[PDB]
Each structure stands twice: as structure tokens, then as C-alpha cells.
């Protein structure tokens, strides 16, 4: 009885504090029954995650046949778009962009959540400002886990997927740091590290750890930056850098 609907999920504004929001509105009995019970799980998760770089869920409300989920409102569009936009980040803007995603990931992990579906098309910008914040979204594939590696199903976007998941090995948190390296890799040059036309040709290249730094583009990227990628695109999970560790690197610890 507080929120007032606007255009379109769809916007809305609190009656008291008048702060714009985004309200996802689901249906009964569409979505079906246990289709709904998949959103049960999913929604619980976003409610554990209250962090500036995570599209925070603020309230969950059951009406009659419709369900309401009040989310942070983000407008700068997808990070994907901003990347095709500018072609590729500078190391500075890149350092900044990745440090934001890292802090969000870090928080997720230090809270038992693994994203899995971490990609550019799932990172939203506050605005297209020259400093705007980045927000994490889409927890459809998110799962809650202990420090113990298992085989938590097989899902994620083909291209960002981790070796350990293609080898049907047990995996945990570091599947996300792998995705980062892919992203951070893209930011610096605007093409992917692993890619082929044939899906299997691809997974092969991934599993293999097959990526390089083609000249001349990479010829002029600070080694400190490559090294940070190298350590995210470490094929052996056990030794692939963690989030809280990546946040302590020079090439990220340089606000000046």
C-alpha cells in the first residue's frame, strides 16, 4: 500500500520516502506452482545479499495472485553494452571496473553464495558516468555452499565456464574468479580469451587453459595487469586467486 506503479518488471516509488525503485511482479498460478518454488529459493538468496554493488532486494510482498519484489533501480544499462560502446576500457577504468565486481563477488563468497552465471551481460551500471558504480544481478544459478567442494550441477554461460566444471569435477567458489578473468580480459581488449564457432572446440580450449596475449594490442598492457588475469585464469582451482586476495593487488590498490 506504499508503492506507486509507473512504466515498465516495472518502476515504482515509495509513498513515504519517495525513492524510485524497480518492482518485479510475478503471477499466479502462472508461474506454475513449483516454477514458483524455484523463485522461493532464488529470492531468499538476494535477501541475504545487501551490498552496494549488488542489485539489492529491499522488500518481498505477496498480494493476491501477484508477487512483488522491490529491487534497487539501475539505469546505466548493462556493462556489456558499455563495452561494445567504448570498444575496450583503459587499464584505470578497467582496474576500477573489476575491483567493483571483485568486492561484490568477495561479499557473495564470504556469505556462502556462488554466482556461476557471472558475465558482462549480468553486470549493471548506475549510470554511464565516468565513475558510476557496477551492480551484480541474475542469481538464477546462484547456490548456497560450504567451504567443501562438490558437484553442484552443471550450468553457466558457455564462454565463461570454468575448467573444473567442464571436467565434471567438484567445484566451489573459484568458478567465479574464473569468470572474472574472462571479463577483466575482455575489458582490456574487447574480445574474449576463449572462443570458437563450435561449442566443443570451445570447452576444449577452456579446459586446456588455452589463451594468449596477441600483439600488438597486449604489447602495451602493464604486466601487473596480465599477471592478475593469469592468476584468475589459473586452471587449477586450488591455486587460483580468491576474491579477497585479488582486492589486495597493487594494480587494484591504486586509488591515487
Amino acid at each position: 500500500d506504499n508503492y506507486d506503479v509507473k512504466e515498465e518488471v516495472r518502476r515504482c516509488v515509495h509513498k513515504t520516502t519517495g525513492l524510485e525503485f524497480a518492482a518485479k511482479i510475478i503471477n499466479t498460478k502462472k508461474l506454475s506452482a513449483r516454477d514458483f518454488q524455484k523463485l522461493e529459493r532464488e529470492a531468499r538468496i538476494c535477501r541475504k545479499l545487501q551490498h552496494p554493488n549488488i542489485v539489492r532486494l529491499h522488500d518481498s510482498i505477496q498480494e493476491e495472485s501477484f508477487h512483488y519484489l522491490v529491487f534497487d533501480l539501475v539505469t546505466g544499462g548493462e556493462l556489456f553494452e558499455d563495452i561494445v560502446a567504448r570498444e575496450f576500457y583503459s587499464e584505470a577504468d578497467a582496474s576500477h571496473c573489476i575491483q567493483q565486481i571483485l568486492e561484490s563477488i568477495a561479499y557473495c563468497h564470504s556469505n556462502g553464495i556462488v554466482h556461476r552465471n557471472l558475465k558482462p551481460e549480468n553486470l549493471l551500471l548506475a549510470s554511464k558516468a565516468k565513475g558510476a558504480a557496477v551492480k551484480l544481478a541474475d542469481f538464477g544459478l546462484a547456490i548456497e555452499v560450504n567451504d567443501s567442494e562438490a558437484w553442484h550441477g552443471f550450468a553457466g554461460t558457455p564462454g565463461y565456464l570454468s575448467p573444473e566444471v567442464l571436467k565434471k569435477d567438484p567445484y566451489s567458489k573459484p568458478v567465479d574468479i574464473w569468470a572474472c578473468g574472462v571479463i577483466l580480459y575482455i575489458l582490456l581488449v574487447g574480445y574474449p580469451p576463449f572462443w570458437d564457432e563450435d561449442q566443443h572446440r570451445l570447452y576444449a580450449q577452456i579446459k586446456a587453459g588455452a589463451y594468449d596475449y596477441p600483439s600488438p594490442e597486449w604489447d602495451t598492457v602493464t604486466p601487473e595487469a596480465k599477471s592478475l588475469i593469469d592468476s584468475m585464469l589459473t586452471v587449477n582451482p586450488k591455486k587460483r586467486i580468491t576474491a579477497d586476495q585479488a582486492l589486495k593487488v597493487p594494480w587494484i590498490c591504486n586509488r591515487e
Binding site: 561494445v84 554461460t157 574480445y191 572462443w195
Partner: peptide
């Protein structure tokens, strides 16, 4: 090597 720029390639897919 090279692969197409992220603009040219398009936007993900997802897998289950």
C-alpha cells in the same frame, strides 16, 4: 590467434 570483439559476437546463452 584472435577472436571477434565482444560487440561482434553477441550476448551469451546460458546452459541447463
Amino acid at each position: 590467434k584472435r577472436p571477434p570483439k565482444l560487440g561482434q559476437i553477441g550476448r551469451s546463452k546460458r546452459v541447463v
